[PDB]
Subunit: 66 residues, 3 copies
Amino acid sequence: LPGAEALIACVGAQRDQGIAVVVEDRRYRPTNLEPGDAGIYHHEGHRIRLTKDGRCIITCKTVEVY
Amino acid sequence: LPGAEALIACVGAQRDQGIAVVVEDRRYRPTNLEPGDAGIYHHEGHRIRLTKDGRCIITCKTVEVYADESMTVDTPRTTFTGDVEIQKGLGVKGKSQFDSNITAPDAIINGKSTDKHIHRGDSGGTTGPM
Amino acid sequence: ADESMTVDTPRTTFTGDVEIQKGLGVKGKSQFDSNITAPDAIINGKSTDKHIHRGDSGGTTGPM
Ligand SMILES: [Fe+3]
């Protein structure tokens, strides 16, 4: 979304050829998680989280397989 | 986890404002995959992998979906290979076929309640129910 | 999955054939909409396909 903080890494030190490598959104980030986690999120909940003891939690609203 | 190798990229060449862009954990990385594979993992198995011939494999231990309204499957065929413990009302619009003894309090057939039905015997009288 | 799979959804549709390969269980009014087929239908403990009524003249009727 607009307002995210990007890290622009200029190529060959020109201020052109600017390439954005990472775009973080600190306002909508999951916090206070267990030591080992890895998932995918959205800016309102919607977490496909992999938790410590073999738990593939899928927190959404209306999941639609196709 | 602690011990991962990060690539610190200082901003403005200062050794301050140091920002970590990537943090790889070479000890817990999936290896020996097919040419085109994209997925998400965890440091003990737990691979949600998308592989060559249209296969979205989900290797985990105890998957727990959490929906708030409904869940549409939308698949022409689905198998289960295991017990199913549907905790509320079922509904089928097709010729369901079972292959073992079914159990129920009573089986309302065409509006006529089994376990209480009485036939009309030969000599014009209600046959005892059973 | 190695252990179990919990859906935890108030409503779920399937739109297609289901081929559950082991025991089923429903704790609610399971309403069907077509002919069901089974070897026998044990109703309230009384085994259908072998039940015998008590006829008018004080005798067992037929197994059907
Ligand atoms: Fe009968």
